[PDB]
């Protein structure tokens, strides 16, 4: 069919220091733009979160990894581009809240309404709102929701689940943070109790400890959590090797991938930025984390099966892949471990545009919940924060700045950030959007009412 | 002719708090970005510079001034979207240096090659490399560069100016500062003086004091740059009605405007940003300038009147128009000083889109030289380095953060950053992009050699 061309070299086109030699275009964009604007709809859809990956987290990473006349061959590949808002709400007063959270954000997209920070899957009123997901399962598509994170976290959580707080992962935390949600309590129930009854074909990431609580109310009162999955008919799978074997995961046969107890281990080891340590101390040169075992499967390995069980249904599907830590090591002032969570990640979305090509009724969209900490400052800089120099893919130094926040955790950031597609109704995203639009746009494209 | 829309309105549609409330989008962008594609040549380019006027900075002033879910009525309006690199060059290596100044940077998108930090139209090996503007003049195209700062400082220097040094200002520096520019010395001169033989047909800003230094070599040895400019033909305006008295403005008759010492007077009052200030003081609301007389014309009425004399020449224009203290104020961690020339920037953007519609074969971009230092943070933040609370549109508070500097002034970020375009080949921008791209999409679209 007609191809939508998916921006294939936007890197420097030679010797930097050289008239030219910088630019990573090498002809007019208009015709190629042209070819890729379609309101075709959409058959299948892949949301690409890169937690907290904002601008200057994607520069850094492309910076350290492939140089800054570099290109990040997944990332930065989607033709079609634009900046969104993500503002949440004050719930006293339903005012805007310049600062969001992993929840806030997450039912953004997902539901099509702002709330407050914290929440997942309901507005201010506490009143329930359904999400995308749900919204595909009944018009007979399949769903997916993938992540690094524990599956309780925010992002995954947001699609599923329905709750006051973000902190009512299963039962316990529930019954005393959530009572109107609380199973015993009559309500709906915990977060992972919630993800078990929503039943999307695919659910991969880590979060296996919440699975070992016990039901108190319920058809399954007394058993883990853990039980009720497999009773229910979830294929339960711990590792790459064991994630291989699955061929068919549907309705009858869902599949939950639990990878590790709490969040999948990170990528790169690199010590924590420090008070002055760009000037007090060496530059960095990140190495692989010798923690994360060879076992536990990729963000790309899993972005992949889940595609590949995915695209069985005629019908077809919807996908949300986040590559959860990158956010996770920006509050841990942690360069290394941050830049290979985005490499992690860009590495996935490399694998989804693949797909996006051959079927040719694909949305690709990849951004970030918010914007973070991280700041790529000037090799001399004396700052007040926590910094780091680094050695690049282009033998120069690159420095980092965390310095929003005294408490140990550095802070998100309201900034407006990037939001890339490629595919039918990628134009949705061009120009300024809010988050909410990327709700409906996903809608519209998959045909959903 | 076939009009290429200009985005009315991505205001919320409505309640914030309600499902679809918070929504930018009315309907599916597909069409309506069609029919804003054109590679029909543009006759004339303006193109607005928010120095150090990154997405943060464009979010903390929309916040501030219109409230999260308002919208710029320039800024935001403008349909095609990016990111782009604005990485320099260490001098020494020809290495990236993530990041540049305001030198390097104008230099980038003016000539089409990559320098180091302080220079003016050199590439690295101090070679020269002909600006946009001047390849215009020879085309016969007319030209134009405004500017709230010292027409002396980089970005509007950039344009006529070729120098070792951005501190090459006048006489007295440059014979002390680029020897091998000083005219006595047999060079091609200061940057003032450069300025005076680029002769563009308007040239408005401040930095009347660099006119006061007398020549010492060449044609117009003795006598005071301002005389000289005036013996040669310029017409020398220093406010806002001698300004308005003008009609013609040529190459007979051409224009120089300069209204104030050094930078114009900045348009908000409001309190520097202190440690801990978003706790320990009251929340700020900005004010206007009392200082800034009113006799000091302002950015957008500049534009107004450089545009409006700029179109008589029946072969195009070419305009740079810059909003210089966003920048200035972004060091200072003066938020009211730094938001207030956003806006002022908003104002002159607005004017630049009024007559793109009109005309029809214009291309409006606006964007920044790097990324800066600012950050919105959450109104609770307690940071190591400047905050404030102010008081938005809203009536929420936003808090802002300066803290990648100990030194006194905050440090610019080399984060990628926004580069909206309207008109002919302004396609060119979206996706990622390198500033010097910048450079080659307006020398294509002006059909420039
Ligand atoms: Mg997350
Ligand atoms: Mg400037
Ligand atoms: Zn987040
Ligand atoms: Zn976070
Ligand atoms: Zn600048
Ligand atoms: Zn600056």
Redesign the interface.
Known sequence: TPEMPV?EN?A?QGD??????????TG???????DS???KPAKNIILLIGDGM???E???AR?YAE???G?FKGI?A??????Y?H?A??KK???????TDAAASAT?WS????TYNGALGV??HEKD?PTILEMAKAAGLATGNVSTAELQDATPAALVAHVTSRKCYGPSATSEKCPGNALEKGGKGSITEQLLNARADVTLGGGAKTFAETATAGEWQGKTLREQAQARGYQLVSDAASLNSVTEANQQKPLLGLFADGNMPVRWLGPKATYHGNIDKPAVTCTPNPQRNDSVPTLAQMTDKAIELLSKNEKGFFLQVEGASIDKQDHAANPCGQIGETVDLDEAVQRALEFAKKEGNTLVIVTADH?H?S????PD?????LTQALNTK???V??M?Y?????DSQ????????I?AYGP?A??V?????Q??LF??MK?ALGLK
Request: no cysteine; aromatic share 4%; charged share 20%.
């Open positions: 921006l936007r420097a930097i220091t050289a008239p030219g030699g910088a630019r990573r275009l007019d964009q208009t015709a190629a733009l042209r604007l379609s309101d904002g601008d200057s994607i520069t850094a910076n140089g800054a006349g290109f930065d989607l033709p079609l581009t634009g900046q808002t503002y709400l004050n007063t339903g005012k805007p809240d310049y600062v953004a539901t099509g309404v702002k507005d201010i709102h914007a900490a700041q790529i400052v000037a800089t004396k700052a007040p924060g282009d033998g120069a690159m420095v700045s310095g929003n926040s005294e408490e802070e998100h950031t309201g900034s407006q950030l990037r890339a109704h134009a949705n061009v120009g300024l959007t809010d909410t639009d409906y746009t519209a």
